[model samples]
Target: GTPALDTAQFTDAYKKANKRLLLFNYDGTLTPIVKVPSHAVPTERTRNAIAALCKDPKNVVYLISGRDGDFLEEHWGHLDRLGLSAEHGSFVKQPGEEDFINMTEALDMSWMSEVEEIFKYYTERTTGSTIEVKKASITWHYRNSDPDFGEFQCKQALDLLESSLAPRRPIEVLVGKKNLEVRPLAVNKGEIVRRLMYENPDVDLIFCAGDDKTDEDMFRALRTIFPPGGVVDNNPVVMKPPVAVTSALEPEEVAELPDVELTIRSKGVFATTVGPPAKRTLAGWHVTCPEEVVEAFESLLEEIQVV
Candidate 1:
């Protein structure tokens, strides 16, 4: 039963958390999706919010995306404390790292040229379509193509690619936002989430937000770690057995009861999707658009500053 996030409730949880982990997708989650990749840069306010969040010692912030390593480095590399994952986790630069380490260095690349040829075929056939070849993947972008024609060609290409390469190659095809991407089967956002959780087991607050098909991987991953907990109204994780509710107690009984403790030490895992509420997604929360996401980030900034 996914719902729109209760921001007030989330903020209260955030204020009490000892360690926080925030994962965000770039293009449609942090910035509005544009026809051209170069035009999907973050706003100044969005950048400021992210920079401030990264500076907070209690938080580990990561922006994982399907974009190329070089593009991510150029746009967000200046935030030294922000972790970066590019090409859908095929490459990553940990917080404060100077360079991205290729995680798919040993993956077979013999399939790259063949995928590129398929992309090239579609690009030439469809007007306004473009092809992007990355270190570990290739994408056929049709955001600028005529919608009717684009959908038509996308279906054809999807069937062709799925049947052609899937049987023999260790790869997967992604029908993403306005594009089709083929990458090594092992590379996915879920692996990034799992790695973060393993390395930071003490973290109690986990918030991940994204908008697109690939983001579902991260959403699904979060679910496996923290399924719905009945400890609270919104189902936040209780680190230890909770104190009994003191409803309708006698004054003497209430007085004898121990102090009502906040669930600050409890674990909270929020997976939010940045799209229509009706959008089919594995995320438990929803926000309408990128601007709302920025607002959420700014709220976190303000809450974290209140010492």
Candidate 2:
């Protein structure tokens, strides 16, 4: 069984969190996943909600995704307050900044063509499948293909992928929802969180969420850095302890707390997953869908306005 999420407690943490983060995975967590990936733009409502959250002095909003830097800049960059990291955090453009900093600039990519050919080979035969070329990653989307055929091809192709990916410098292939991606081992959403936290070390809340294999990296990254006791206790080995870190305050308990206590009480990870739920997820909380994610952001904005 999955854990039941208490919005009251999450809101309580938000209410008193001195420095809060609202980070999300782009496609599935904010906007519904779509067949034509580019068409999955942030709905006006989602954009506005994020913009409002960004307007708040105490909050930070970031969008971490596997999409490329230029794509995020062209589509979502209008929200100047939004922090953007593309190619699964290989490139980062901090909020209020103009240019992006490429994390994979120094990475050796002598094998880029070999990997692209592999992705292209499957994409050609897998009817309805398409390939996306990014600066730091290559993605093959098979969501529009025959499910059984696509899955079989993906599984069988993995051996080749593993073989090629093994000796090819820093490249690795990962399976995401109806897609296969090849990216550098060093670049991931977790590193984005690490960079964000180090830039703003005194955060009161760390809320991260997503709904795919890649998203787990972000969740695990947050858990690792913001370990327990409302601060980082970087244990040498990374491990997941169920019910680890701070627990959300009960309603009655929340009522009696001051901002200081609230900061102390709320200063920890509040990671979540957008359903359908996964029992083995790194996230500690769960919501049924993206609509619920939108609701959470809306509620947070409303609460701030009323204050």
Candidate 3:
């Protein structure tokens, strides 16, 4: 039972944010989920809203996605001034960088071929289901397939993936909206969250929103610095031990800084999630679909006008 966000308080905080940071997931969050990835472009309203937010001197905006790093840059050229994370945070290009920092290139991909074969097996048999080969990972897209059939197929895919990749460390199957993406374990949006917070510790208000499990990592990372008032168990995405993160930024690096104690009601975190409330999550609020996301953005835009 996914509940809608506390609209009144959220609006009040949006109006109050002086130095804000906005983190967004591209697919299904900014636009309607489409069969073709290219067709999943944001609407004019969504596009313009983001551009304005980035232009605002008081805000820091980031669009982090599971898409290819190049794809993100090509489509959202207006956001070049902000940070862009791609391939589920496997690739990152901070603002003012000429090239994206791809962690996958130097990663231990010894098991990649074996995993791709397993993915290809199902991709060939399943009608309307296909495999998408990213620079670092392989994703099986079943959005166009029959819902019940695609879901059962996804289960089959994950089961095989677990057994096949069990011997290797850091390989994982990320179950997302109508898809199961296999990639490195430690490489996640949480790392991006940690990097941003660690680099700019003084920025007070932080806004995060997304549609699925991938976004949960960001919310979870928030708790590492600002506790969620509850104990969160370890992540189940990968069945491997934690090693040094391939990319930059670590808890130890940031832990040295004095933790700022802010006595806000909800720790000043606005997490707009789309999914059932019954499901375990770290999000502070919920939005029904992309439509609700648009509404929230619209509200924020209107609120920013007078400031």
Candidate 4:
């Protein structure tokens, strides 16, 4: 059973942790989804909370989002010690880094052309649908279209994508927030979570919050390390059959680390879903909306002041 995250027990755990990792999803998680994509900006309270959290030496904060790098930079660039992972980990600008690092250079992006045709076909038919072409991924947005028609079209697009391209290519079709996106199968929020956790072995607390299907990837990744009842899932992390290397350009594989003795206190990890508790999620906790998420952030900041 998932509990609400803005509670005394959670704050106590967060306050007790010496080294903390805070990962947040942008749209629908940190901020509301607006009818106009350009209108979705973080509130003043959210901005202040983020800046204060980044200033804490005990906390490492990252905003893992599907938005483009330029969009995130324009809004959140000046925040001190804030890590930004844009296009869902295809590009990352770590704390103190002056430039965003392209993480998908090793993968072949040739599949994008065909995927574009698929998205284009739907965009032309749907009245208010639009396509967002990014460096490593493409999204077909139907947020402004009629609900029933948009959903029907989205399902149609997903079926075509799954049948035509997913079988042969190294790509993933994701459904989230009235949009359908296709990106390199290996690139996801989970990769960043895994990488950052490995790099910061001393992290005593990991608070990951998100509201969409893409965020489920991070929740699943965190589950490997912190399963319920403190029992590690015996399932092997990789279950995919190896693809034959056909050319100099091949699909990028998230580097597999050699099995090692890893230990983390289970109580310190919190994977939270930002929506109704009735919504199905892999997260062990839930918060109703962005305002509650802001409250959690503010609570953490208050913990520092209390000390």
Choose the strongest candidate by lDDT: 4
Model 1 ranges with Cα > 4 A deviation? 226-267
TM-score of each: 0.85, 0.84, 0.84, 0.87
Candidate ranking under lDDT, highest first, comes to 4, 1, 2, 3
Q: Each model's C-alpha lDDT?
A: 0.81, 0.75, 0.72, 0.82
Q: Which residue segments of model 4 deviate by more than 4 Å? A: 226-263
Better of 2 and 3 by lDDT: 2
Q: Pick the candidate with the highest TM-score.
A: 4
RMSD of 4: 4.7
lDDT of 1 by residue, 115-186 (tens): 999989999999999999998999999989999999999999999889888778989899988899998887
Task: Write candidate 3's Cα lDDT for 197-303 as tens digits.
Answer: 54554555778888878888887876655343543353221111122232343567535444333322234778777765665677877776876787787886787
Query: Per-residue lDDT for 43 in model 1?
Result: 86
Q: Where is model 1 poorest over a 10-residue stretch in terms of lDDT?
A: 238-247
Local lDDT at 214 for model 3: 84
C-alpha-based local distance difference test score of model 3: 0.72
- In the order shown, the candidates' Cα RMSDs to the true structure are 11.3, 9.3, 5.6, 4.7
The alpha-carbon root-mean-square deviation between model 1 and the true structure, to one decimal in Å, is 11.3
lDDT of 4 at 77: 93
Question: What are the per-residue Cα lDDT tens digits for candidate 2 across 136-194?
Answer: 78888888999899998788667788875656568778888888888887677877776
